[PDB]
């Protein structure tokens, strides 16, 4: 009876942790979309902690975790001292690109546009910090012809403020990513914890 | 409409965070009661993070936070390098004693027994580490006559393994605290998130 009770309790804790992960993902998406930097930081810390208390993951929960990790790396895209992988050479935007290619999602036009904007900016952020040799190394790791050769020419000329980086800017990458985040927000707005909390708030109006 | 929606969303996030705090407190109590050291550590990290995302606290939520903080200091009672207060001189058991005296709860016989056991052990843990001068300083900060004079005599004799510390031992303090934790477990087992999760598990049996 003691082991049977402990077992049912552990199963209930796993159910509640899954509900907490979905809610925290929704809150993280909304903070990213709104540009609420401090709320994003605190929500990320909460999400990471809840994830460490989870063991079995369904395919849906792994996709949710990948979305949280992807937005965290994009938020840190210009923080070149942040090490997100065991290989210390991988920059934050290169780490976001790896997760973007692993998520079980449709490869629609928006998917490829975000992918190519992260590739251009992974090089651009190195150039803007005067890290010319690092830009060439990020280029080799990513690329792994017309798009490729324009980028290599810009790296070799050390043209940091090139007009190419203004046409495919960091702001344009953020805006395209926010369009994708809006779809995730619509999909997760109906998850258990947010629905129950919204019902309580509405009943008091 | 944009500010009105943002407002309702923030209210719903506060409701869900309150439900998460109660659930995490219940899980932390159960890990402490069971002696599941690693689960206690991970649950504490999750609790701390959720608490940083909360702003307005009801009297009930402040009591819940005090219970989490109290068990954390008791779990760290023998870690004399842990600094829980801005005043670096305060030891973990002295910090647990301060919280124990601040919780809005009945001062029954069990309350006073736990209080006195934490006082004896706050000195005992210093003696057992050979920190005789620190034991005298903890004594002065706490005490703050027959109980008092026996303790001062033991500190002055440097009688670390005194039979007094075996009669009012660290294990006896932990057991009395676990009795109190069982009452908190019964009280919080009916909170929203645990009840809903338990209903899901049961419906699959
Ligand atoms: C489990 N990882 C996780 C979860 C949520 C947000 C960020 C991360 S991280 C530290 O990998 O960027
Ligand atoms: C808000 N503080 C908190 C919450 C839960 C568990 C432990 C703590 S602490 C770091 O103060 O020991
Ligand atoms: Ca670097
Ligand atoms: Ca110390």
Curated annotation (Swiss-Prot), chains A, B:
Region (TRFH mediates dimerization) location: 1-205
Encoding gene (name): TERF1
Domain notes per entry: The acidic N-terminal domain binds to the ankyrin repeats of TNKS1 and TNKS2. The C-terminal domain binds microtubules.
Subcellular location: Nucleus; Cytoplasm, Cytoskeleton, Spindle; Chromosome, Telomere
Tissue: Highly expressed and ubiquitous. Isoform Pin2 predominates.
Designated name of the protein: Telomeric repeat-binding factor 1
The protein's assembly and partners: Homodimer; can contain both isoforms. Found in a complex with POT1; TINF2 and TNKS1. Interacts with ATM, TINF2, TNKS1, TNKS2, PINX1, NEK2 and MAPRE1. Component of the shelterin complex (telosome) composed of TERF1, TERF2, TINF2, TERF2IP ACD and POT1. Interacts with RLIM (via N-terminus). Interacts with FBXO4. Interaction with TINF2 protects against interaction with FBXO4 and subsequent polyubiquitination and proteasomal degradation. Interacts with GNL3L; this interaction promotes homodimerization. Interacts with TIN2. Interacts with RTEL1.
Residue(s) carrying Phosphoserine: 156
Free-text description of this protein's post-translational modifications in UniProt: Phosphorylated preferentially on Ser-156 in an ATM-dependent manner in response to ionizing DNA damage. ADP-ribosylation by TNKS1 or TNKS2 diminishes its ability to bind to telomeric DNA.
Membrane-crossing segments per the record: none
Known function: Binds the telomeric double-stranded 5'-TTAGGG-3' repeat and negatively regulates telomere length. Involved in the regulation of the mitotic spindle. Component of the shelterin complex (telosome) that is involved in the regulation of telomere length and protection. Shelterin associates with arrays of double-stranded 5'-TTAGGG-3' repeats added by telomerase and protects chromosome ends; without its protective activity, telomeres are no longer hidden from the DNA damage surveillance and chromosome ends are inappropriately processed by DNA repair pathways.
Outcome of swapping residue 156 to A: Loss of phosphorylation; induction of mitotic entry and apoptosis and increased radiation hypersensitivity of ataxia-telangiectasia cells
Span within the parent record: 59 to 268 of 439
Coiled coil: none
Induction comment from the UniProt entry of this chain: Expression is tightly regulated during the cell cycle; levels are low in G1 and S phase and increase during G2 phase and mitosis.
Residue location of crosslink Glycyl lysine isopeptide (Lys-Gly) (interchain with G-Cter in SUMO2): 150
Outcome of swapping residue 156 to D/E: Fails to induce apoptosis and decreases radiation hypersensitivity of ataxia-telangiectasia cells (phospho-mimicking mutants)
